[PDB]
Amino acid sequence: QKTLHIYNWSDYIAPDTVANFEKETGIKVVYDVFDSNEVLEGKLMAGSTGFDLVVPSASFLERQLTAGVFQPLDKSKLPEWKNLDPELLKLVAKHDPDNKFAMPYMWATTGIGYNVDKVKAVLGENAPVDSWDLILKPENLEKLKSCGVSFLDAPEEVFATVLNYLGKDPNSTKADDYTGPATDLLLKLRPNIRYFHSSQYINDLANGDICVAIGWAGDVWQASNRAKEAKNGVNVSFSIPKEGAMAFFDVFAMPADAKNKDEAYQFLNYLLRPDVVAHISDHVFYANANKAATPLVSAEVRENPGIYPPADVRAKLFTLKVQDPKIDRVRTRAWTKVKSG
Ligand SMILES: [Cl-]
Ligand SMILES: [Cl-]
């Protein structure tokens, strides 16, 4: 009679996680998947989804903090909550103050995807692939222009990255920071950027038509794996630069009208086990938010600096704060001015 209804991304869990949880607890888990965040968000805002646990983005959960859509997590029913990284917890608290509604599941960054061979051919073995200097210094973008440079069509993320690169507050609330120095540097870099797109760079990296790109980690790993599967000889790598990068989190959350709260808390505690989430990370190739699980992650994933960055880089990570409307308008018009080049 024990029932638990979960809604998650497809292939966003280890193949045997649900089976092991069912065999250990005796609960019958109804595990449904979605291939697009629009479906999950529309169902959640429509209400009465019938799900006990869902996996939305932390930004959507932040947008839905006062709508009564999610249930505040009873921290007393989660003793292993201490296993979570306090640094990543502080990072996600900006989307969820006091970590009230969401348990961080996996996370990724907005970093640099690049062709190793072409970059080291036009910039040498000393190419600063571990720094935004590779793509945010005009002197290097001039030498990289011939092999192809692409930027995301995401003004918020790109502007936050540029503000962090310039030493300013990555989520500055001053419009002068956006219209002034950030716009100045972006317009200085513009003549070397081939296009602004948030999806074409995947296949363009896989085929070698683009050699350096601002990209989300999952997209760059998909491009590199596509190149590997094609056996085309294109070596695509992803780097979280040393100056820091924007981080984004997927979270487990409990809808307010969940009928199986006990089983949901049991599943959350199961996910808080280091070995469980470490196995999940071994399968999905994403870094999890469980510190105690880090030594248990496979050396293939744990020792990848583009997935598990060192402490000095993790201390420079940041999340995207929701901006006041005037900042949004200034950002959009500045991005329109930048893209006109
Ligand atoms: Cl995802
Ligand atoms: Cl994102």
Swiss-Prot record:
Any single GO CC term annotated in Swiss-Prot or TrEMBL for this entry: membrane
Pfam family, one: SBP_bac_8
GO MF terms held by the record: putrescine binding
Disulfide topology: C147-C211
InterPro entries in UniProt: SBP (IPR006059), Sperm_putr-bd (IPR001188)
Binding site for putrescine: S10, D219, D250
Gene Ontology biological process: putrescine transport
Main location class: periplasm
Keyword Cell inner membrane: no
Domain of life: Bacteria
Localization: Periplasm
Regulation of protein activity: Transport is feedback inhibited by intracellular polyamines.
Alphabetized UniProt keyword annotations: Disulfide bond, Periplasm, Signal, Transport
Oligomeric and partner information: The complex is composed of two ATP-binding proteins (PotG), two transmembrane proteins (PotH and PotI) and a solute-binding protein (PotF).
Protein family membership: Belongs to the bacterial solute-binding protein PotD/PotF family.
UniProt function note: Part of the ABC transporter complex PotFGHI involved in putrescine uptake. Binds putrescine. Imports putrescine for maintenance of the optimal concentration of polyamines necessary for cell growth in the presence of glucose.
PANTHER family linked: BIFUNCTIONAL POLYHYDROXYBUTYRATE SYNTHASE _ ABC TRANSPORTER PERIPLASMIC BINDING PROTEIN-RELATED, SPERMIDINE/PUTRESCINE-BINDING PERIPLASMIC PROTEIN
Protein's UniProt name: Putrescine-binding periplasmic protein PotF
Species annotation: Escherichia coli (strain K12)
Lineage: Bacteria, Pseudomonadati, Pseudomonadota, Gammaproteobacteria, Enterobacterales
